């Protein structure tokens, strides 16, 4: 049956919707496994594929990008989503493919990049691509990773680990950190990511857990902010989110805490 992320209410997106801000004319790139644009509840304004063997960005063989799409749209119902396919049906993608998707997004004047994905290896190529995006005025959001804790050392994945990216970790409905949510200095903010009910290919819906899911909410929130303030730079959108977050626990585990888009939007 149809369902919506409980995270929408928890980040206070309805307060923006009722004010007339639903993400209209804000372009959001979903760098993922594609987006099933058949889904009766999704709208896709465009896209492109950088997976060599899967050249249709509008057919989601994994289901992950479709789930991202639905969570983003649930937060920002009127946002223009673009399916930048950088992962295969197996949920894996080479850094070089991801970089082409990032470059594509910049060249098509995307306002927001969501990357609900991560890898353990660093890359100067991947760092230069996300930095270039940020220097271009793009708000870049990424899942912190599902690696849990390792004492006092960082478990945040790339690209989320880079300073220029908004690294998003996961909470449940209680604002309690998910046990598997990655941690470290590079963690910026949290958002709902436990059993986030969203869209799946074939007109289906389902609950999934991960920082992947948390990142989706923040990317939607950025679009709402740019909805109300189309004049704000990415610097400014990121500031509001970080400075108006609801403090939860220690910043190594919770960053600045839960995003509050209503507070961010004023």
């Amino acid at each position: 049956a149809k369902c919506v992320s409980y995270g929408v209410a928890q980040i206070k997106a309805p307060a923006l919707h009722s004010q007339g801000y639903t993400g209209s004319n804000v372009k959001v790139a979903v760098l993922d496994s594609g987006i099933d644009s058949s889904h009766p509840d999704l709208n896709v304004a465009g896209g492109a594929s950088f997976v060599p063997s899967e050249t249709n960005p509008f057919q989601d063989n994994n289901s992950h990008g479709t789930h991202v799409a639905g969570t983003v749209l649930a937060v920002a119902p009127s946002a223009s989503l673009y399916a930048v396919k950088v992962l295969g049906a197996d949920g894996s993608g080479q850094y070089s493919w991801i970089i082409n998707g990032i470059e594509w997004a910049i060249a098509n004047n995307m306002d927001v990049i969501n990357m609900s994905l991560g890898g353990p290896s660093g890359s100067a190529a991947l760092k230069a691509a996300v930095d270039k995006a940020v220097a271009s005025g793009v708000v870049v959001v990424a899942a912190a990773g599902n690696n849990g804790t390792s004492g006092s050392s960082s478990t945040v994945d790339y690209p989320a680990k880079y300073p220029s990216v908004i690294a998003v970790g996961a909470v449940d409905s209680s604002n309690q950190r998910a046990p598997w949510s990655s941690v470290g200095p590079e963690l910026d903010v949290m958002a709902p990511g436990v059993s986030i009910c969203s869209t799946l290919p074939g007109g289906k819906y389902g609950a999934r857990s991960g920082t992947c899911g948390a990142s989706n909410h923040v990317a939607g929130a950025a679009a709402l902010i740019l909805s109300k303030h189309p004049n704000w730079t990415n610097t400014q959108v990121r500031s509001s989110l970080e400075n108006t977050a609801t403090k939860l626990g220690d910043s190594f585990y919770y960053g600045k805490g839960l995003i509050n888009v209503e507070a961010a939007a004023q």
């Binding site: 993922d32 894996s92 993608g93 080479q94 850094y95 994905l117 890898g119 890359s123 991947l126 992947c212």
Partner: peptide, 9 residues
Amino acid sequence: VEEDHVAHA
């Protein structure tokens, strides 16, 4: 190629 890594969802 050696330097092209893989990321996952």
